[PDB]
Amino acid sequence: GFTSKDTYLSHFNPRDYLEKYYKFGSRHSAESQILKHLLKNLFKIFCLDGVKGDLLIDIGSGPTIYQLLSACESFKEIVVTDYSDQNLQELEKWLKAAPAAFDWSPVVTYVCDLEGNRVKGPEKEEKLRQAVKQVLKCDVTQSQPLGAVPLPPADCVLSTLCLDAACPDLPTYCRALRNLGSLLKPGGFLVIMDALKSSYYMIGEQKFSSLPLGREAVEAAVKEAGYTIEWFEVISQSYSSTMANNEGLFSLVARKLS
Ligand SMILES: Nc1ncnc2c1ncn2[C@@H]1O[C@H](CSCC[C@H](N)C(=O)O)[C@@H](O)[C@H]1O
Ligand SMILES: NC1=NCCc2ccccc21
């Protein structure tokens, strides 16, 4: 009763996802209100709080880079990961500054604004491109998410809008949190942002299953998985009716218990 893993390889259109959720158009859409809030939290986590280190692993990056714009100010290296090779190719297109890459300029500008206008768009983009060295395949459902590929234990593991889409049930969800912890150094940071109580999301006519969790189930799973929560925020803002049936989104910062 849940989207098969292999559907992500074939039917998740990276460009269409970017057009539908991250175009950041002139009209005050629900998608843009969500994106602005996620950016505020990411700015607060990486620039205001002490979330820093040599390595940050982004889990289930999809074709997006918005979740890394503040992070590149605090981590020497950022490793981007996704189950879809098609998604990693779209990421790589932006990373190499190709002309057919997605235009992130209204999002890049917004981040520079948030950060105190210390830098401009081109300088911001360059710091991120220099931070990303590895573009890897990952599967959160596996005990070794990065498979046979080795990495030093991360200082931080970030995952935006991935676990609800990747986990068919609550046992898999708690298991995936434990699997992300195996990529984390003891006492390392876990940053998760996702939808609340969503049973699906859409990319045009293409439907994708989502695990509908309430904030209590998310908190319980993080505790069961061996983390300690530092903060937890719920926003009431949901996606447009045509996109998903969520009841807001959550953001949390936790630490791996040694
Ligand atoms: N088992 C799995 N392991 C890892 N990534 C998975 C996965 N199942 C789905 N995904 C990925 O999870 C993503 C959900 S969309 C979220 C994309 C991006 N992080 C953002 O914030 O918009 C897709 O890129 C999909 O390919
Ligand atoms: N992974 C997602 N990407 C787009 C928005 C969304 C809404 C609800 C559940 C999942 C998602």
Are the C-beta atoms of residues 193 and 250 closer than 8 Å to each other? yes
**Backbone region of residue 27 per phi and psi (left: phi > 0; alpha: psi in -120 to 50; beta: other values):** beta
Mutate to test the pocket of ligand 1, among 162, 206, 210 (most ligand atoms within 8 A of CB): 162
| 66 labeled binding residue | yes
Helix intervals (H) in 30-168 = 30-43, 85-95, 105-114, 121-131, 163-166
Half-sphere exposure of 191 (CA within 13 A, CB side): 25
The answer to whether 140 is annotated as binding is yes
> Which ligand lies nearest to the CA atom of residue 208 in the structure?
2
Is residue 21 a contact partner of residue 243, using CB atoms and an 8 Å limit?
yes
Q: Which residue of 2, 5, 8 sits with most ligand 1 atoms within 8 Å of its CB, as the best mutation to test the pocket?
A: 8
Q: What is the resolution of this structure in A?
A: 2.0
Q: With contact defined as beta carbons under 8 Å apart, do 32 and 134 qualify?
A: no
- 113 has binding-site annotation: no
> How far is it, in rounded angstroms, from Cα 113 to Cα 152?
33
Q: 84: Cβ below 6 Å to ligand 1?
A: yes
Domains by residue range for the chain, with CATH: 7-256 (3.40.50.150)
Q: Residue whose CA is closest, atom 7 of ligand 1? A: 166
17 is in an annotated binding site: yes
Q: Collapsing DSSP states into helix, strand and coil, what is residue 242?
A: coil
Please tell me the distance between residue 118's alpha carbon and the centre of ligand 1 in angstroms: 32
- The burial of 188, by beta-carbon neighbours within 10 Å (0-12 exposed, 13-18 middle, 19 or more buried), is given as buried
